[PDB]
Amino acid sequence: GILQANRVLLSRLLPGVEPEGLTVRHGQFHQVVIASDRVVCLPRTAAAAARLPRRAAVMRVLAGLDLGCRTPRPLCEGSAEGAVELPFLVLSRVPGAPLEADALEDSKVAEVVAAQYVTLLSGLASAGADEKVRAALPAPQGRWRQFAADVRAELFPLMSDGGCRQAERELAALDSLPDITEAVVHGNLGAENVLWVRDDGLPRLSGVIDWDEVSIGDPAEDLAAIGAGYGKDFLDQVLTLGGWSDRRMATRIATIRATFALQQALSACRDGDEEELADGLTGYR
Amino acid sequence: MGILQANRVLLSRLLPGVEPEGLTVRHGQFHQVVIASDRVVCLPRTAAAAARLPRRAAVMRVLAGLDLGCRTPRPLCEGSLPFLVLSRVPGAPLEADALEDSKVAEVVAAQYVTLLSGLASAGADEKVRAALPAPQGRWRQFAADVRAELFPLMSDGGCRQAERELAALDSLPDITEAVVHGNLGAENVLWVRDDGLPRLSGVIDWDEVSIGDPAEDLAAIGAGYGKDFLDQVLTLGGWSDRRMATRIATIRATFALQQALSACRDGDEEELADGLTGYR
Numbered sequence: 001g002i003l004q005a006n007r008v009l010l011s012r013l014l015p016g017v018e019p020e021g022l023t024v025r026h027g028q029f030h031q032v033v034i035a036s037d038r039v040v041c042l043p044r045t046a047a048a049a050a051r052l053p054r055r056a057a058v059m060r061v062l063a064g065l066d067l068g069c070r071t072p073r074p075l076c077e078g079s080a081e082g083a084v085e086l087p088f089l090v091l092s093r094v095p096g097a098p099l100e101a102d103a104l105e106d107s108k109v110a111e112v113v114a115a116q117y118v119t120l121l122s123g124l125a126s127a128g129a130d131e132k133v134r135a136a137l138p139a140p141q142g143r144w145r146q147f148a149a150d151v152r153a154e155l156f157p158l159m160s161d162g163g164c165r166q167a168e169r170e171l172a173a174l175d176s177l178p179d180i181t182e183a184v185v186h187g188n189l190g191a192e193n194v195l196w197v198r199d200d201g202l203p204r205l206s207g208v209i210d211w212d213e214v215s216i217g218d219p220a221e222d223l224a225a226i227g228a229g230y231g232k233d234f235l236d237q238v239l240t241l242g243g244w245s246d247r248r249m250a251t252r253i254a255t256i257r258a259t260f261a262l263q264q265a266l267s268a269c270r271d272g273d274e275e276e277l278a279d280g281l282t283g284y285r
Numbered sequence: 286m287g288i289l290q291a292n293r294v295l296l297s298r299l300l301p302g303v304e305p306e307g308l309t310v311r312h313g314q315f316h317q318v319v320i321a322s323d324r325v326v327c328l329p330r331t332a333a334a335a336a337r338l339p340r341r342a343a344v345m346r347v348l349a350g351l352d353l354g355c356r357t358p359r360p361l362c363e364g365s366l367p368f369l370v371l372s373r374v375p376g377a378p379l380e381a382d383a384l385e386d387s388k389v390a391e392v393v394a395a396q397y398v399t400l401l402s403g404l405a406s407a408g409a410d411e412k413v414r415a416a417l418p419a420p421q422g423r424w425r426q427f428a429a430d431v432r433a434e435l436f437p438l439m440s441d442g443g444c445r446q447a448e449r450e451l452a453a454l455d456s457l458p459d460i461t462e463a464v465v466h467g468n469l470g471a472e473n474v475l476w477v478r479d480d481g482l483p484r485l486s487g488v489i490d491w492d493e494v495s496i497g498d499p500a501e502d503l504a505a506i507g508a509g510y511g512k513d514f515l516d517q518v519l520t521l522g523g524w525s526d527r528r529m530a531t532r533i534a535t536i537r538a539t540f541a542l543q544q545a546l547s548a549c550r551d552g553d554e555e556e557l558a559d560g561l562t563g564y565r
C-alpha cells in the first residue's frame with residue numbers, strides 16, 4: 001500500500017506518527033496522505049513529481065486570496081517552486097466537516113450558508129482578473145469540447161447503450177458554451193470539498209479543499225457543482241445573493257450542471273477511485 | 286456592560302447563533318481579541334489602533350501569502366468600531382520541559398529553522414519590504430527612551446550597567462535583511478502535540494512585525510528556552526558565527542530594560558519591578 005511504500009519519507013515528514021493511523025485520498029497525479037493537521041502529496045509518477053513545483057506556487061497564490069475562509073497552505077519553502085520536481089508537497093489541513101443537504105431545510109441556515117458561498121465565489125471571481133493570479137493558474141481553451149472527447153473515450157466503454165445516449169445529449173450541449181476565462185474556478189466544488197465548523201451556532205465556512213482542478217475559467221462551473229449537490233432553490237438563493245441570476249449565467253449553469261456527475265466519474269476513473277466511479281456512473285449503466 | 290455584551294450586534298453578525306457569553310476575550314497592547322472556536326475578532330483598544338486596523342489587515346494578508354512552513358492568522362473579514370476577523374491558529378505553546386528529550390529538541394529546533402529561514406527569505410522580497418514597517422535606528426530611539434524614563438527609577442550602579450548595555454546597542458549595524466516577528470516568545474508559537482513529536486502549528490501576535498535584524502527573533506527564542514536550545518537552532522540553521530552571536534547577546538541584554546520600559550508606560554508595577562531587578 002501507499003502508506004507502506006512511502007513509510008520511510010512519512011516517518012521524516014510526520015515524526016512519531018504511526019503510518020497505519022493515517023488516511024489516503026486518491027488524485028489523478030498525486031496520492032494525498034492525510035494526517036491530523038496537514039496533508040502530504042506524493043506524486044504517482046515522475047511527471048506528477050514535475051508538477052508539484054507549480055502546485056506549490058498555485059496553493060501559495062490561493063492562500064493570499066480574500067475568500068472569507070481557509071485554503072490548504074503550502075508548508076514548503078518558497079524556493080521549492082523553482083525545483084524541476086518535488087518528491088512531496090505538504091499542505092495545511094483545513095478543519096471542519098461537509099454540510100449535509102438536510103441542514104438547508106432550515107431557511108436561516110440556508111441564508112447564512114448561501115451568503116458564505118457568495119463571499120467565497122465573489123473572491124474567486126475578482127481574483128480571476130489579476131495577472132499574477134492568471135500567470136500562476138492554468139487557463140485551457142476549448143476545455144468543454146475536450147472534456148466531451150475524454151468522456152466519450154474513457155467513460156462510454158463503462159456505460160450502457162442507454163447511458164451513452166443520455167450522456168451524448170448532455171455532452172452535445174457543451175459545444176454551445178462560450179469559452180469564459182474570467183474567474184478563479186475551483187473545478188470540483190462539491191459538498192465534500194467545502195468544510196464547515198463543528199461548533200455551536202449556525203454553520204460557519206471553515207475552508208475549501210481539493211484544488212487539483214483549479215483554473216481560470218467560467219464561474220458557472222462552480223455554481224453548477226453547488227446546484228448538483230443542493231438543488232435549484234439553494235442555487236437560486238446563491239445566485240440572487242451574489243448578483244448572478246441573469247439568464248445567460250443560469251443557462252450556462254444548467255448546461256454544465258447536467259455534466260457534473262460525468263465530471264465526477266471522469267475524475268474517479270483517472271484516480272482509480274472505484275466507489276466514486278460507481279456513484280458517478282449512477283444511471284449511465 | 287461587559288465587552289461581549291457591548292459588541293453583541295457585531296458578534297451576532299460575525300458568529301451567527303453563537304452565544305456571546307460562551308466566548309472568551311484576551312488582549313495585548315492594542316487589541317481586544319474575542320476568541321471563538323476557529324477564529325478571533327480583533328477590536329481596537331484605542332482610537333489610534335482603530336485608525337491603524339486597515340493597515341494591520343494589509344500586513345496580515347501579506348504574512349498569509351508567505352512560505353514560513355506553518356500557519357499565520359488569515360484575515361477572513363474586515364469592517365467598520367473597525368474590526369478584523371482572523372483564523373485561529375490551533376495548538377498550544379511548548380513548555381521548556383519537553384526540550385529535555387533530545388529527539389523532541391532536534392525536531393523543534395528544525396521547525397524553528399524553517400520558520401526563521403522563511404522570515405529571512407521573505408525579507409528580500411520588495412513587495413514584502415514595501416508592505417511592512419522598517420524604522421531607522423530603533424535601538425537608538427529605545428536607548429533615549431530608557432534614559433528618559435527608567436534611569437530616574439534606577440540606582441547609580443544600575444544606570445552604569447544600563448548605559449553600557451545601551452552603548453553596545455549603538456555598536457550594532459542597522460540590519461534590514463529579514464522579516465522580524467519582533468515578539469517571538471514561547472506563547473506566540475503554537476504546537477500540535479500528542480500526535481507523534483511536536484509539530485509547529487503556527488505563529489500569532491504579529492503587531493511588532495518589521496523588516497529588521499533576525500538576531501532579534503533568535504534572541505527571543507533564547508530568552509524563552511535557554512542557550513542550549515538556541516545553540517541547537519543556530520547550529521542547525523548555520524547561524525553560529527561570532528558576528529551573529531554578538532548581536533544576539535547585545536539584543537538579549539536589553540530584554541529586562543524592554544520589559545521595564547513597557548511596564549513603566551502601562552503602569553504594570555510587577556513587570557516594572559521584575560524588569561528593573563538588576564538595576565536598583
Ligand SMILES: Nc1ncnc2c1ncn2[C@@H]1O[C@H](COP(=O)(O)OP(=O)(O)OP(=O)(O)O)[C@@H](O)[C@H]1O
Nearest residue numbers: 311312313314315316318358372373374489490492
Ligand atoms: N490568530 C489567533 N489564534 C489564536 N489565538 C490568538 C490569535 N490572535 C490572538 N490570539 C490570542 O489573543 C491574545 C492576544 O492577542 P495579541 O497578542 O495578538 O494582541 P494584540 O494587542 O493585537 O498584540 P500586541 O500587544 O503585540 O499589539 C494572544 O495572546 C492569544 O491568546
